[PDB]
Write a protein that binds this DNA or RNA. Structure first.
Length: 535
DNA sequence: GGTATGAGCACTGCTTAGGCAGTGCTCATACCGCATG
């Protein structure tokens, strides 16, 4: 399929940077079989992709190589980083996103050999015949753990296979899935023939990366929030009884239920008439909102609870009317209204402030290159509250929030990049980030990472810890409320080990795609050629 | 329920034109959630 016999004699490996065994072995593996590469962040998933893409570029000179990333900033970062490693002239490559008109993309597809794009552009260009589907010989998928359900990654492969089976897939993920079931879906969706995995624990990784120790700070909930929690549980009980009596909700202890368990109960209901549907849907929507509020109170604090409730109690939803007829709700809501110096709406926030102050004290005492602190909380109200709390210490602490595009106005792609550049240059020394700061964009190495919340899935914890590494031995602090939050953390670490074992096990836990094309003709055994690549 | 993201089209400012290059909007994805190999 257009394979260049002469180029097939060799596979070229860059020596610009010292050769690492794990990068040499994994690169070679990925040439001959569809591979999912799982390395810690900063240990060279991008380098391996560049090596693979450059050799496919050489081996299929009339073919195309495609690199997919989930965000526009990541596309730009990755084309730049891969350009530096590969021996491909700038004129043979292009970035393509929704910022390039579909009309222009057709000309870029035809004139370029390597394309870095968002997967939605690829889906659109395949369906509309702008992408010459048959000419694709290599497809690199970054953040490949996102290749679940009908995500654009899954759509690209399903559409491409209509036109050609003769391409290599390289998937890159530090965190292949939340569990085995998710890892199996990624393998199935992306036609993965094998996994090449190294952990922080891996000896061949320890050489090129400082081990980083996790500190846990357990914070008791305290009298004030305990008392509000106790009032909240009774409000929860009164609004959930209808679902207990309707038998749509199992009846499992009201205080121990989660918003996720009720969204599932609602979903199981929506697949099993008239006035009835309206009242049940209404009861479910009220309970899911209250249990959201309950989670905010336990994990984020009273200010987060208030702001969420204010969004509801600000139009006439049924939720607004019902909750408005409850005196305990309106008592609590009116109390939070009054409440909102700086108010410490969760004991975790006071503990977070102590840790950050002590870090800057200890750093400035050692007197000169500014320290960098990244704090992760999932909710926008928490991130703004944490930022306001730490703003009291300006300009010793120079805090900025890092949030997604949706409006608390939200940040555009351009505004996000300015905050990152400000963080890198020490304009800001402290970043408070939602999940947008966990994935892809090279923020830089950070001296202190703080996790304000915890999830049962291990993915986001590993991503958050990825923002510190070798260059400078970093510190990872995890602030947990005592009880549940401590168990969620213990579960995420157990789930991480479970996935590692399953991937590494001699027994076939995972079902790999067995029909990955060799791509190099069966006659040709390409020989390693190490060289200094010059542009 | 909130958190990201995306594309394509709307809208508007430019120093000098263009589907430029920005932000805004509507419509899609996905996750979270049992616990293990």
């Amino acid at each position: 399929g257009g394979f260049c016999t002469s180029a097939g004699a060799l596979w070229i490996y860059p020596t610009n940077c010292p050769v690492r065994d794990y990068q040499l072995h994994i690169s070679r593996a990925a040439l001959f079989c569809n591979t999912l590469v799982c390395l810690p962040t900063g240990l060279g998933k991008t380098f391996i992709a560049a090596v693979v893409m450059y050799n496919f570029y050489r081996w299929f000179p009339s073919g195309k190589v495609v690199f997919m990333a989930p965000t526009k900033p990541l596309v730009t970062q990755q084309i730049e980083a891969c350009y530096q490693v590969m021996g491909i002239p700038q004129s043979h490559m292009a970035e393509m996103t929704g910022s390039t008109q579909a009309s222009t993309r057709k000309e870029i597809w035809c004139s370029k050999r390597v394309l870095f794009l968002t997967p939605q552009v690829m889906v659109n260009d395949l369906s509309r015949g702008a992408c010459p589907a048959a000419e694709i010989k290599c497809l690199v998928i970054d953040e490949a753990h996102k290749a679940l359900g009908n995500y654009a990654y899954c759509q690209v492969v399903r559409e491409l296979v209509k036109y050609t089976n003769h391409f290599r897939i390289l998937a890159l993920s530090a965190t292949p899935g939340s569990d085995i079931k998710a890892v199996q879906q990624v393998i199935t969706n992306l036609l993965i023939g094998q996994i090449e995995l190294r952990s922080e624990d891996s000896p061949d990784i320890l050489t090129y990366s400082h081990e980083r120790k996790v500190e846990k700070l357990i914070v008791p909930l305290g009298e004030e929030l305990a008392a509000i929690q106790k009032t909240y549980i009774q409000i929860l009980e009164s609004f959930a009884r209808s679902l207990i009596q309707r038998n749509v909700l199992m009846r499992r202890d009201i205080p121990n239920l989660t918003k996720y368990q009720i969204i599932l109960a609602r979903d199981q209901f929506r697949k099993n008439v008239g006035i009835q549907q309206g009242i049940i849907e209404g009861e479910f929507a009220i309970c899911i909102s209250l249990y959201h509020g309950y989670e905010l109170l336990q994990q984020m604090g009273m200010r987060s609870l208030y702001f969420f409730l204010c969004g509801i109690m600000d139009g006439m939803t049924r939720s607004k009317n019902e909750l408005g007829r409850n005196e305990d709700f309106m008592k609590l809501y009116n109390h939070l209204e009054c409440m909102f110096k700086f108010v410490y709406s969760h004991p975790k926030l006071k503990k977070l402030e102590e840790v950050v102050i002590e870090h800057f004290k200890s750093w400035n005492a050692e007197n000169r290159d500014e320290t960098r602190v990244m704090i992760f909380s999932s909710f926008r109200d928490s991130v703004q509250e944490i930022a306001e709390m730490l703003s009291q210490h300006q300009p010793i602490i120079r805090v900025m929030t890092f949030v997604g595009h949706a409006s608390t106005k939200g940040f555009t792609q351009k505004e996000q990049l300015e905050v990152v550049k400000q963080f890198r240059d020490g304009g800001y020394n402290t970043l408070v980030s939602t999940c947008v700061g966990e994935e892809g964009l090279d923020i830089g190495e950070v001296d202190l990472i703080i996790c304000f919340d915890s999830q049962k899935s291990p993915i986001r914890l590993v991503q958050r810890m990825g923002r510190t590494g070798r260059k400078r031995q970093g510190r990872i602090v995890i602030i947990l409320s005592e009880g549940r939050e401590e168990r969620i953390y213990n579960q995420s670490q157990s789930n991480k080990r479970s996935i590692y074992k399953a991937i590494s096990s001699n027994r076939q836990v995972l079902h790999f795609y067995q029909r990955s094309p060799r791509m190099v003709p069966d006659g040709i055994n390409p020989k390693l050629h190490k060289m200094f690549i010059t542009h």
